[PDB]
Amino acid sequence: AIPELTKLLNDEDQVVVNKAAVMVHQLSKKEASRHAIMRSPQMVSAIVRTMQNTNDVETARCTAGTLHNLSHHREGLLAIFKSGGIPALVKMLGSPVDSVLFYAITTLHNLLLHQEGAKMAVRLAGGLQKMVALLNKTNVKFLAITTDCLQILAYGNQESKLIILASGGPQALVNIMRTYTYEKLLWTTSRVLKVLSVCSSNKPAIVEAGGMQALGLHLTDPSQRLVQNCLWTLRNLSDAATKQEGMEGLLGTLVQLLGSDDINVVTCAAGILSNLTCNNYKNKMMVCQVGGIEALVRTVLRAGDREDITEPAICALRHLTSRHQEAEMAQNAVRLHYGLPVVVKLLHPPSHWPLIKATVGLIRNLALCPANHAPLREQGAIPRLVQLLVRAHQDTQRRFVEGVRMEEIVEGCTGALHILARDVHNRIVIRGLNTIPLFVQLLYSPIENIQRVAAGVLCELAQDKEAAEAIEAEGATAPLTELLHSRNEGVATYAAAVLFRMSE
Amino acid sequence: PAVMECYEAAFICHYV
Ligand SMILES: *CC(=O)Nc1ccc(NC(=O)C*)cc1
């Protein structure tokens, strides 16, 4: 009856197409007849023309249901695809009744999963915009199919991620994250957000929509694939969420998550916490109150050579030990939690430059606490900081290694030595390493920040007349008198200080 | 004195 049935759909009068629709639908639920529907292109075409032109809701539900049943096999799938189907079901994603909406999204989903060239076809028809507009629906199974469709198209396609963003993608995807509990929908939604989080233009939109807090709600779910997709997305956005409020719950969970047995969970937790504590005084406190210093120290002790874990954890320790209230107590807490020996050890190989630069800054802030001077000394921090300073300064004299700025090590090492020189015992070790020639040669550096730490460590060393004479013997008076009129006030203050202690 | 209290004030600025 297939040859005759194409005409009843290519004909006016409702019931004629309606009956035919409520007649081809039945020839679709039976395998013998259905095998003949896909076999005929005139049939397949006629149902597409009827579906996207119909006025009656039963024809729309019966047609879209017929092509949905066609989409379960390869020959029917490409029959939909070849007869210009995808543009029609994309149109049907704007229907006001839920039956055709369900039928269209499942047929498009099957095409996106099993039809070659359907991802390009759906993209061009404006599918991404329609799929995002459907994210406000309430059927979680419908939402699970719709978000998986978006994931199929957004994955590895930059143009797709931009279109999703322009349609309010992040906010609608974040809303799903903080509303529903169906694991498959949460896991699929998290896949979409993970794909979007690697795009710099989607990063602030997900953050501004509250996506950080929304992902934190599911960090304790029993689904391992859901927590890790949540953690990967949080890691990506972390650098663009340093201003968000309401981070108390998320930060609390991340601190607890540092003790996880899973390697990927710990790495992500340290990475998120590092970025989240950077220049956010409020985050620095909250992490300290939930005992983050202890957690990060134990995390570092557990990692050993795993630099993908120690680099972010030490960064977070560096953030939590400076420029906020509890920084003083956080400086003591690293020592009281048996952290000092591991920090100094990480200055030595096989640590690479990213880890070293982060460790130096931590030691710099750790040295602000005078109770850390002796235990840092007995770990060998002074000769190692000088070894790094000499090598870094030797490289800048060639007239960027491992991604780090080589003069940033000169500023960081000399600055840490400046702090340590506050203690008299440390001064002995600094002086005994033949470093005064190096500290005077750094006064001729053009980088104002290097001139400051150099004059600083020279100022502390000059408390002792023997050291002040050696410094004078290296011809420091001339660059110091010039640095008196430096545009940088901190250098002029430091330069005046070294010249003053040269009283004898 | 004078020059030294200058230094301690600029030292707190540099790190604390
Ligand atoms: C001479 C003097 O008082 N110098 C001085 C005072 C304060 C500061 N403070 C900061 O830089 C924050 C610098 C230099």
Residue numbers in the entry:
A (entry chain A): 152 to 550, 560 to 664
B (entry chain B): 2 to 17
Paper text:
To target disease-causing proteins that are inaccessible to small-molecule or antibody therapies, we are exploring the use of a nature-inspired drug modality that exploits the intrinsically favorable properties of synthetically constrained α-helical polypeptides (Helicons). Here, we report a rapid, high-throughput screening platform utilizing phage display that enables an unbiased mapping of the α-helical interactome of a given protein without any prior knowledge of its structure or known binding partners. Analysis of 14 high-resolution crystal structures of Helicon–protein complexes across six different protein domains reveals a range of binding modes, all of which are “side-on”, i.e., mediated exclusively by Helicon side-chains rather than involving main chain amide interactions. Biochemical and structural experiments demonstrate diverse functional impacts by the Helicons which bind these sites, including inhibition of protein–protein interactions, inhibition of enzymatic activity, induced conformational rearrangement, and induced dimerization.
Using our platform, we screened β-catenin at multiple concentrations, and in the presence and absence of an Axin-derived Helicon (which binds β-catenin as a short α-helix) and the β-catenin-binding domain of the TCF4 transcription factor. Analysis of five β-catenin-selective binding clusters from this screen revealed two types of binding behavior: binders that competed with both Axin and TCF4, and binders that competed with TCF4 but not with Axin. We next turned our attention to those Helicons that competed with TCF, but not Axin, in the phage screen. Biochemical assays performed on members of Cluster C35, which did not resemble any known β-catenin-binding motif, confirmed competition in vitro with TCF but not Axin. A cocrystal structure of one member of this cluster, FP05874, showed engagement of β-catenin at a similar site as the naturally occurring β-catenin binder ICAT, but via an isolated α-helical mode that has not, to our knowledge, been observed previously. To make a preliminary assessment of the potential for the binding sequences we discovered with this platform to be rendered cell-permeable, we selected six Helicons from β-catenin-binding cluster C35 and synthesized a total of 18 Helicons with the cysteine staples replaced by all-hydrocarbon i, i+7 staples. Several of these Helicons maintained measurable binding to β-catenin while also demonstrating cell entry, as assessed by MS quantification of intact peptide in cells after treatment and washing. In summary, this screen for Helicon binders of β-catenin demonstrated the ability of this screening platform to rediscover a natural α-helix binding site and mode, and also to reveal a previously uncharacterized binding site and mode.
